[PDB]
Design a protein around this ligand. Structure first.
Ligand SMILES: NC(=O)C1=CN([C@@H]2O[C@H](COP(=O)(O)OP(=O)(O)OC[C@H]3O[C@@H](n4cnc5c(N)ncnc54)[C@H](O)[C@@H]3O)[C@@H](O)[C@H]2O)C=CC1
Ligand SMILES: NC(=O)C1=CN([C@@H]2O[C@H](COP(=O)(O)OP(=O)(O)OC[C@H]3O[C@@H](n4cnc5c(N)ncnc54)[C@H](O)[C@@H]3O)[C@@H](O)[C@H]2O)C=CC1
Ligand SMILES: NC(=O)C1=CN([C@@H]2O[C@H](COP(=O)(O)OP(=O)(O)OC[C@H]3O[C@@H](n4cnc5c(N)ncnc54)[C@H](O)[C@@H]3O)[C@@H](O)[C@H]2O)C=CC1
Ligand SMILES: NC(=O)C1=CN([C@@H]2O[C@H](COP(=O)(O)OP(=O)(O)OC[C@H]3O[C@@H](n4cnc5c(N)ncnc54)[C@H](O)[C@@H]3O)[C@@H](O)[C@H]2O)C=CC1
Ligand SMILES: O[C@H]1[C@H](O)[C@@H](O)[C@H](O)[C@@H](O)[C@H]1O
Ligand SMILES: O[C@H]1[C@H](O)[C@@H](O)[C@H](O)[C@@H](O)[C@H]1O
Lengths: 379, 389, 389, 379
């Protein structure tokens, strides 16, 4: 990657949410504006119209296209020949469904934050409106943009681990060990299952695209009792079709842990393990051989895992590179749709409406199991 | 520790098992003989009397005290004024019960290998006989000898982690990812119910970090558990080479044990993480001289063996200054000197010394058997919650 | 940082070099374009005008502002009312002096790639011209943009390490262990004196952690140094692919720099350890979000980017909450926004803002050239002590 | 290793030093008594006769063979048919020469602590007395007993690193960062050069037996000024015959460092790196390939590196195992000498009189260079 243009002109783009004091607003813009993928021309940046406009102007947005709310954004932009083509939804979880639905009905492509929405019926309603209106829905499972996730997928498909036996996933941080705005709204049918567990779950779907969950059980806890019934800790044990096992540990009360997102795929011959805090390395551990570390950008990687390198091996890339790798694919997908290039659109892989639906499905089944005291449920 | 004797004379000692080709025989002797705790004066070292006697002679044992079997060992030693006072049992799991019972009935102290036996009923029988005969029974949960386990126990009791919320345990190695039992006698018996018992990895490796949790959290009581177990090498069924045990403690803390012999690429992977409201501790058997201590909101720390900031109890067993790596042989030596002090204290009827000593004993052995039995009951019922007691 | 503009309008910007196949061209643009600091409106991107123009068009540059060479770029842009205000120079080392001088004489601000130039005389000439023309000169010591470098500087100034005794620096990678310059244009020019200068690894990688030491210890002055340099790939002689620089600071602290491109197996290996009477700090470029902080007698600590326990100056540039990994692109973005603020402040004659800004500037570039020149003088005399000034 | 006897009966053994409060006394006994190599039958354990005897009795020694001093030990033991055959010298550095010389003249085999002695003339005097009296002198370069040091030697000899270019050694701990009995005497022509620098120097001699130092320079400092002229920090840069370079960083003022003994051997093709605090792993880093970690006890190791395994791979061995590996070789060497088995004696490798001499030579040359302001000197 050298900043060459992927599409003829940047997608005309807005955000809803991601305002001045938001945790995630900035990485959406840093990734979307990079390499001429998107141009930020409008937004409803803040729950408060006045702060949305002040912030919007500082981002270089036309003051008149800093709108009080998503409805006004979609209505007013529809009247302009240079109106937005796509919107990123970076609001709290409870508004994802309504905003995404409104954007799709207005004929806009959408990038929606995870978890996509609360219920599986909402998720499949967004999917059917997206399909009817021929719109791209991206979902910011940002960690999936790291090159070594593709390396892992390519190695598993090539049989380098032998027969897959176990998938061990965690996203277990300590930032909510204590009863500490962003946290207030998080504390919806779930907290950490949707907030963090869905991340390495989606990494498992990228690495093992043919794996199907047969049944699962989930035991969830509110260690900070005032969060009940929202869980700040959960254990999900899964049986895949064919007899492989999966385990997801979701947590916001793993005291001392800075992030702790890890995925270990264990085969008959070898394991791989990836850790989000050191995203440029992939452990590759053949039983009976010295353990190995695979590095981003090295010539021994599969060709697919080298495509998105922005600097030579040994220079650390980070999560902004991963997000940039998703956003250029989002832009290529939206552009392909506008030009009616069904061929390009068919060859692209990115976290899409189907990834969003599967994350919502998984949370729903975990909550069903957990509310019943951690019993097996059919997936 | 400077090699000073702990008891007036070494305990007169034998082994059953632990012969020439055994995996674990050597660490028993290396730990028992150290610092004048035990003297190896007899044994039945091998399933084959001939190989047992040839090996016994190489260990410096009198050829006439290399016996063909444990029955002969106990009978012939009873007829000597310098007869053994204690025996270590390092045979496959299926013989632990019979040998330990025979040794207790012959009036001997015992160090029995884990797992103690197959059934909770066997375990309670050995406990009754050990009590009736006033004998010490040690169990070689060897990892519990590492000083930083005592550091973790002292910190938790002192409230340094806040309120305990989770205990995450694994012992997940990759050595049996392939069907190596075809080629490897030690693996072979582990995958035969007649020889290994109701389980493979739950008893073989899961009980290790479980016992570390009992040392760190002595007042925790498991309320209920569930266990899902797999035979990834299908020929091992019904014995599991992988298992997940999820536990609810009284008080609402959660425990998780991952037991595995098919974690391909893992050299050992025994880890325990204790998670509290304020902080976490994490210990890893392959780097036993360090303890991760992670206070939420503060820089992570590593606590090092032998440093002046440790609790006094965690410094007692240091054999060399901080920074020099101790290993699993030091951990086993720390259990065996305690075994010797317990056995000597019993012979001298020193109830006071006996009360101050902490070592893996008959009760630790019984709890390990109880845990495996409950896991197997849950797993055989499709991994459903079962009452622990 | 939330993408808020730092200056009223983006600086009108070009590059010389950094074309389609370049190693470093992209990170310049990724950092400069971010957060509305610079706008890329022209360039001479390639040694080959045709490849420069085709690439320029893919970058969204007007085909008529893709110029064949730097002279044409400066001349033609001067004839436009929307002419460039600043240029980044990403060419091989041998052209830095001529291009930077030409840009300064054309009244342009400059971001010049390290090393600034070949000789200390060239460096002092660029400094004089930059001062006469009131122009900012940034130097892309990019690793200095990492927040935890500012954390280390703040801790040292606060006396958290005690009295500083040693500074241990390396940048020792293995990419040129084999003679890959046969095959690789970027390696090829680095091993030719005409193109690369008086040194290879001293200037190419040694100057990076050296500049980190100047950021962390701004009041340290090198008194004298010695340098032993080797050409392990003999065809590179007289340019070194390995070097040891030992330095005595005024005050009696010692510094060590290991510069290498033949550290086989090393992916980058840029590290700085600052050792004081009370504690040490250690930073490693491949894991830039952590800082080891090791107080003697206490548990080692790791300081994490974005945590509330950091000094306020080390939190200013956080673009995402603690635990999410930033990378070298964030470090470069942190230097480029400062470059833009410095250039804008100069144009508005805002002496006050200019005094508060810290970034690698003409003086950092001169000191890097001085250090290489002294090392080469020592090495050519068989690695003897030489006076630094 | 399964505790099988290497020699027909244990060597009759004494210590001088290594008493109740000594730092190193215990590991000598733990290693020497193991696997029936040595039997502790006498000693002069303490500078104070009374404390030597009290401690001696607690170690199981005949009270009458706990002697006030080394002269009395050697004289009285010579009168007994069951008299000592060998002595380990664990006293402060200044007494090594006199005690070792006396032991050799009394016809005893000796294990002497490093550094062997102060001067090269003393070292070559011990060598000539040892040779004249046909005695074994072992030197407790204990780290050399770790199996993966042999693995490194075997890999280098087999050309696995390509042509050797650089040897980077450190022993840099922080325990004397502050002006803190054992430390008092350490603070002799040197402190950290002899106390710690000689350790990884000897590892380089085991790994690269054919390497010869051509010239070196050493810059040494007294950061705790009251130690002057003894150095608590030193840098030694070395040129080997053939143009490889070596670097030794010796330190007791590396604040926060728990031990920091490391050796990295860098070849044209690959590097190896060993760290004493994690002695069961060896980094093996082929340029252009994933980095690897070699583990103690694994089947992929050279046969020589498996001989001393006392437990299966994955169980951590420590420095007591390394010392035990030196002491059984010391015992086999002494026994071979007594039986006049010149054949066995010739096949054994252990840190011996020659290792002791080379450590003393290296310290002398470093001190010569450092006293002259860190100038190159011929080796
Ligand atoms: N993909 C990932 O890695 C991450 C995703 N997220 C997701 O991003 C979303 C936002 O999370 P945070 O940034 O942490 O929340 P936040 O609470 O930090 O910020 C929310 C922002 O949305 C604005 N806002 C709220 N309601 C609005 C409305 N109706 N219209 C317009 N603006 C509105 C607020 O003014 C604020 O600027 C959530 O869905 C969360 O799950 C958050 C962090 C990481
Ligand atoms: N505490 C720990 O960390 C470990 C415990 N163990 C336990 O130690 C025991 C032995 O395990 P391994 O050494 O791996 O087995 P192994 O198969 O390697 O050795 C068994 C030994 O006992 C001998 N033996 C078998 N039956 C005998 C009998 N009836 N009488 C006398 N000798 C007999 C065999 O000849 C052999 O010497 C098992 O209970 C196992 O669970 C094993 C490894 C580690
Ligand atoms: N700050 C840092 O971390 C790094 C700095 N650098 C520095 O950046 C500079 C470039 O290095 P690389 O990108 O590795 O070199 P490279 O060989 O990869 O690329 C050189 C580029 O400049 C172009 N070029 C050459 N001469 C030119 C001229 N007269 N006019 C216009 N374009 C010209 C070439 O066509 C090519 O696009 C060097 O000074 C190097 O020291 C390089 C890598 C990292
Ligand atoms: N090989 C290795 O890894 C190590 C070697 N050493 C070396 O071991 C030797 C001793 O070091 P530490 O144990 O640290 O010293 P220390 O000061 O801790 O103990 C010295 C012991 O020798 C006794 N002693 C002193 N003079 C004596 C004499 N004339 N006769 C009999 N006993 C005497 C003292 O009573 C004391 O027991 C030194 O040469 C040191 O360099 C020390 C630590 C590690
Ligand atoms: O490999 C394991 C390990 O040695 C355990 O410590 C032991 O309990 C098991 O029996 C053995 O199979
Ligand atoms: O590989 C290195 C690295 O990118 C350094 O950051 C740079 O200064 C050098 O020029 C380059 O060769």
């Amino acid at each position: 990657i050298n900043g060459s243009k992927r599409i003829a002109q940047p997608i005309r783009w807005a955000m809803v949410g991601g305002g001045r004091n938001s945790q995630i607003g900035y990485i959406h813009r840093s990734a979307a504006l990079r390499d001429q993928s998107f141009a930020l021309v409008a937004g409803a940046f803040d729950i408060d119209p006045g702060r949305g406009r002040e912030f919007g102007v500082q981002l270089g947005v036309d003051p008149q296209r800093c709108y009080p709310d998503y409805r006004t954004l979609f209505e007013q932009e529809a009247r302009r020949p240079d109106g937005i083509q796509a919107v990123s939804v970076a609001t709290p979880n409870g508004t994802h469904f309504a905003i995404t639905r409104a954007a799709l009905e207005a004929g806009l492509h959408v990038v929606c934050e995870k978890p996509l929405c609360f219920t599986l019926e909402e998720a499949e309603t967004l999917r059917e409106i997206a399909l009817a209106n021929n719109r791209v829905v991206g979902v910011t499972y940002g960690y999936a943009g790291h090159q070594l996730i593709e390396q892992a997928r390519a190695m598993i498909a090539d049989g380098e681990l032998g027969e897959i036996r176990m998938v061990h996933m965690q996203f277990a941080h300590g930032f909510h060990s204590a009863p500490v705005e962003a946290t207030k709204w998080r504390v919806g049918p779930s907290y950490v299952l949707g907030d963090v567990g869905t991340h390495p779950l989606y990494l498992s779907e990228v690495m093992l695209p043919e794996f199907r969950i047969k049944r699962l059980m989930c035991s969830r806890q509110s260690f900070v009792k005032s969060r009940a019934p929202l869980e700040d800790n959960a254990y999900t044990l899964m049986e895949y079709e064919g007899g492989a096992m999966g385990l997801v540990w979701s947590s916001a009360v793993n005291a001392g842990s800075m992030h702790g997102q890890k995925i270990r795929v264990i085969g008959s011959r070898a394991s791989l393990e990836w850790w989000d805090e050191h995203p440029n390395q992939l452990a590759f551990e053949i039983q009976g051989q010295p353990v190995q570390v695979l590095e981003r950008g090295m010539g021994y990687l599969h060709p697919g895992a080298l495509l998105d390198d922005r600097i030579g091996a040994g220079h650390p890339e980070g999560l902004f590179e991963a997000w940039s790798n998703l956003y250029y694919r989002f832009a290529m997908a939206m552009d392909a749709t506008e030009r009616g290039d069904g061929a390009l659109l068919a060859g692209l892989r990115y976290p899409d409406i189907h990834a969003g639906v599967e994350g919502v499905r998984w949370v729903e089944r975990c909550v069903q199991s957990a509310d019943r005291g951690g019993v097996w449920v059919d997936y």
